Design a binder for this molecule. Structure first.
Ligand SMILES: [Zn+2]
Length: 44
């Protein structure tokens, strides 16, 4: 046989909440701001 081997690793931060890939890590962190919400008023 000797087919070979698999397994690669390429730096890439992507939001696993919506589905958006970014270049840096600070760009994604500033995006999760819209994801997180707050609780208080019932009506909402
Ligand atoms: Zn997102």
């Amino acid at each position: 046989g000797s087919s070979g081997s698999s397994g690669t690793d390429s730096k890439s931060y992507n939001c696993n909440e919506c589905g958006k890939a970014f270049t840096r890590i600070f760009h994604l962190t500033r995006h999760q701001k819209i994801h997180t919400r707050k609780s208080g008023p019932s009506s909402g």
